[PDB]
């Protein structure tokens, strides 16, 4: 790795992001926000995605 | 030495639940 090389054999850092969809609890997750629960009427739900 | 495994090694393949069904 030398500055004049050409930029095929320039230096290139690599980060890989690997993660398992939904199976089981989960840990990372987005910025959305939460709100109350209501019971016995027809809502939209969306549980952990 | 050896000895006959009856009927273990069974284990949930997945992490999902599921209830009174025949699974393949």
């Known amino acids: 790795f030398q500055p004049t ?8 850092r690599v ?7 939904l199976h089981a609890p989960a840990t ?3 910025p959305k926000k939460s709100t ?4 016995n009427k027809c809502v939209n739900f969306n549980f952990n995605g | ?3 006959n495994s009856f009927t ?3 284990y949930y393949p997945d992490k999902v639940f599921r ?3 025949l699974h393949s």
């Open chain 1, 5 to 12: 090389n050409g930029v095929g054999y320039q230096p290139y």
């Open chain 1, 15 to 21: 980060v890989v992001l690997s993660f398992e969809l």
């Open chain 1, 28 to 30: 990372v997750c987005g």
């Open chain 1, 36 to 39: 109350n629960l209501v019971k």
């Open chain 2, 1 to 3: 030495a050896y000895t």
């Open chain 2, 8 to 10: 273990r090694g069974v």
């Open chain 2, 19 to 21: 209830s009174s069904v």
